């Protein structure tokens, strides 16, 4: 007889899921930023994952790490021992993720990888580097993780599969399954999930598209729907398509990054749409908004924003 179906990613809320550790509170994708965040109450982290030369999986958004750190070019045309090296909050200021070339100043965390500013207390110069995947992992063993897939170049899908093929050999040695593996590129996901079966997925961008618009449901092993607030023009985040998503069994997972702001209105409002995760770029104010609003967590029952 058919096995019944099991989503538990309907019961893990309300989420606060630090994005990159909360790019705008923290260097994004550092050891710092995801320590820092899981202390102030995120239950969850969110990154992105590139490779080496060597076929290492290191935690990092752009193909290039001009933008984040003092170094230059692809990381895939460096070794890791190449790339960790950088200083990973070289550029890192509050309230703008990173901007590279203003004065020495804007700059609170730049020199404490390389040796040059003490650390926060508590943390030390290599929780400011480019890390790798098995060291987020196994700094993080009871912590759910939500790694992005990301490419060389949004026209290069063979990069795109070969870091779905390398996550899915190190994901499988660990034997967790409390993760969520998505990618914009859909073949990636796909890739993914034929290498490692058990893994919770969640639809790329196709697979986003042929469910919202023609009502299609995702690839099998889709656990819930990872969105944006809006995209091209439309809003996506609505009460309305959050409700059908609950109607066929995702959890839904609102994301941020310019498609909206990252302030208390929009947490606030996209809280009240039901959803059961949010991104922000803020980890420690959305902490702040969940808390003064009494609302339900995982292992915490409280107020149902619906």
């Given at each position: 007889t058919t096995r019944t179906t099991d989503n538990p990613w309907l019961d893990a809320r309300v989420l606060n899921m630090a994005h990159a550790g909360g790019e705008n509170e923290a260097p994004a994708n550092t050891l710092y930023a995801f320590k820092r965040a899981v202390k102030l109450g995120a239950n969850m982290l969110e990154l992105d994952v590139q490779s080496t030369k060597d076929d290492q999986l290191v935690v990092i958004h752009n193909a290039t790490v001009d933008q984040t750190t003092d170094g230059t070019g692809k990381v895939?045309?460096?070794?890791?021992?190449?790339?960790?090296?950088?200083?990973?909050?070289?550029?890192?200021?509050?309230?703008?993720?990173?901007?590279?070339?203003?004065?020495?100043?804007?700059?609170?965390?730049?020199?404490?990888?390389?040796?040059?500013?003490?650390?926060?207390?508590?943390?030390?110069?290599?929780?400011?580097?480019?890390?790798?995947?098995?060291?987020?992992?196994?700094?993080?063993?009871?912590?759910?993780?939500?790694?992005?897939?990301?490419?060389?170049?949004?026209?290069?899908?063979?990069?795109?599969?070969?870091?779905?093929?390398?996550?899915?050999?190190?994901?499988?040695?660990?034997?967790?399954?409390?993760?969520?593996?998505?990618?914009?590129n859909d073949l990636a996901v796909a890739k993914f999930h034929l290498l490692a079966p058990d893994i919770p997925i969640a639809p790329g961008m196709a697979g986003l598209a042929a469910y919202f618009l023609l009502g299609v449901k995702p690839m099998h092993g889709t656990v819930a729907l990872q969105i944006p607030v809006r995209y091209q023009g439309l809003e996506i985040a609505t009460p309305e398509f959050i409700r059908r998503a609950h109607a066929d069994g995702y959890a839904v997972h609102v994301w941020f990054s310019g498609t909206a702001p990252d302030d208390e209105a929009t947490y606030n409002r996209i809280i009240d749409s039901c959803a059961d995760g949010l991104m922000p770029a803020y980890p420690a104010l959305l902490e702040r908004i969940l808390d003064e609003r009494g609302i339900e967590r995982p292992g915490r029952p409280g107020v149902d924003p619906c």
């Amino acid at each position: 007889t058919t096995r019944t179906t099991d989503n538990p990613w309907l019961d893990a809320r309300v989420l606060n899921m630090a994005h990159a550790g909360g790019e705008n509170e923290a260097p994004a994708n550092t050891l710092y930023a995801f320590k820092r965040a899981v202390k102030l109450g995120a239950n969850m982290l969110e990154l992105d994952v590139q490779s080496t030369k060597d076929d290492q999986l290191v935690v990092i958004h752009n193909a290039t790490v001009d933008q984040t750190t003092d170094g230059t070019g692809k990381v895939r045309d460096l070794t890791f021992e190449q790339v960790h090296e950088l200083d990973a909050a070289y550029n890192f200021i509050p309230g703008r993720h990173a901007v590279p070339g203003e004065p020495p100043e804007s700059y609170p965390l730049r020199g404490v990888r390389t040796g040059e500013k003490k650390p926060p207390p508590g943390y030390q110069p290599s929780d400011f580097a480019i890390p790798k995947l098995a060291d987020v992992l196994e700094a993080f063993p009871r912590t759910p993780i939500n790694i992005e897939i990301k490419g060389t170049s949004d026209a290069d899908i063979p990069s795109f599969l070969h870091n779905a093929k390398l996550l899915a050999r190190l994901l499988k040695k660990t034997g967790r399954t409390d993760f969520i593996v998505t990618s914009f590129n859909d073949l990636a996901v796909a890739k993914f999930h034929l290498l490692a079966p058990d893994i919770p997925i969640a639809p790329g961008m196709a697979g986003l598209a042929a469910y919202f618009l023609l009502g299609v449901k995702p690839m099998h092993g889709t656990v819930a729907l990872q969105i944006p607030v809006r995209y091209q023009g439309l809003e996506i985040a609505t009460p309305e398509f959050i409700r059908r998503a609950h109607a066929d069994g995702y959890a839904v997972h609102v994301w941020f990054s310019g498609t909206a702001p990252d302030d208390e209105a929009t947490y606030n409002r996209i809280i009240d749409s039901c959803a059961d995760g949010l991104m922000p770029a803020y980890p420690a104010l959305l902490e702040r908004i969940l808390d003064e609003r009494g609302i339900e967590r995982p292992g915490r029952p409280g107020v149902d924003p619906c």
